[PDB]
């Protein structure tokens, strides 16, 4: 109906996309229809007029002598409220993920060129050894991923000294034009149960930077552990 | 109509009683109702078929073509809005002075007794000029109404300390059966900004019921400061 969408047009200046048009037994002009936000993505359900020129939210405050609208109206909140619930879960990962320092994550190209484009982020910690099983897995994800691995300071006081150190290490490896090969042996060598961590003078200032960008990945709860993959 | 009524009761157990009925320029079939909810005494705005048989509540998720729907439906979503905010308003003040200890409120009776009925709450500091200067009509307030006083300790330690030998002093008032008279002038004396509050042994236990009496008053910012007087 191109009528709905221009009335909401007009008045809000956004341009849904009509996904769901289902009748109602209890009435004869008006419509169930589900709309998708343009910008939140955000699933709507309305009843809409005939014409397109009424359009009322629908809401759990709905009743009728039909129990098969009550029910319709049902499934469909819950739908879109699951669907919606997805949607802004995603929305969060990404802002999380955007909200890390640029030179923060381990960007390792896939060894397929033509994979280069697929964008997975990996939360790990390296005193984590769940994490340690996942890094042996890495060359074999980038045969089908780019990887952004984040090291995070989040299970204790050596998972941060662990991370600053990866820090200072790929800063020192970027700088020299260091090879993919390279970044991974780093971080073998660091994740390993037997590198002698009290062994290393800790920089201070990366430590900080560790432990700022760790809280604000753990902040919301959305992220509730690792290792934590993310498809972006 | 009885026919939305006794929809809505058979699949809420709510009976609601109906205040307004309006027309929409923008259908034939559908009409604007306000609702009163029996238990929370909300006022909630409904589209409603012509049978009452077909009921969607009303929010900001409105369109139509017509602008005169468009602004019905804003006017009456503020003004509802603005009579449950008041509500919602009204009940916590209600739960904030019933859950107050039973014995804490001092209770004074109307010197008539026409008006014994009417409940004047009155939140006051024994520290405080403002709550000085309201205690002085507390005579003049028992004409019309029956005063429950609730003395705080709020603005600090000596307020504290002064409400729990109040509290003290009116556990014996009450014991030998003291008068009105007599518990005014527990709370003058008590009041007075010469009385020497580091003169008096203060009880313990006491001090905590005020402690513990006042946080909760406070808690919500329902109630910002004092003398806070409510018309229950």
């Not at 005939?50 to 009743?63: M, Q």
């Not at 929305?91 to 994550?105: G, Q």
């Not at 991923?145 to 006081?157: E, H």
């Not at 991370?163 to 700088?175: C, D, G, H, S, T």
Request: proline content about 4%.
């Amino acid at each position: 109906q191109d009528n709905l969408v221009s009335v909401i047009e007009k008045q809000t200046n956004k341009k849904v996309r009509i996904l769901e048009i289902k009748p109602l037994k209890s009435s004869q002009d008006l419509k169930m229809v589900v709309i998708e936000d343009p910008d939140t993505k955000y699933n709507i359900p309305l009843v809409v007029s005939k014409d397109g020129n009424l359009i009322i939210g629908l809401s759990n405050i709905f009743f009728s002598n039909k129990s098969d609208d009550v029910q319709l109206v049902a499934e469909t909140n819950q739908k879109v409220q699951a669907l919606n619930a997805t949607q802004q879960n995603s929305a969060k990962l990404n802002a999380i993920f955007n909200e890390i320092p640029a030179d923060y994550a381990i960007e390792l190209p896939s060894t397929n060129a033509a994979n280069k484009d697929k964008i997975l982020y990996i939360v790990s910690d390296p005193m984590c050894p769940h994490c340690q099983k996942e890094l042996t897995k890495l060359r074999d994800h980038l045969k089908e991923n780019t990887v952004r691995m984040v090291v995070v300071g989040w299970l204790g006081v050596n998972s941060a000294k662990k991370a600053a150190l990866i820090q200072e290490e790929m800063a020192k490896a970027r700088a020299r034009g260091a090879s993919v090969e390279d970044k991974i042996s780093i971080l073998e060598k660091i994740y390993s149960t037997q590198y002698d961590i009290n062994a290393q003078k800790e920089p201070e200032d990366l430590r900080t930077k560790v432990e700022n960008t760790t809280k604000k990945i753990f902040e919301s709860g959305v992220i509730k552990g690792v290792p934590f993959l993310y498809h972006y």
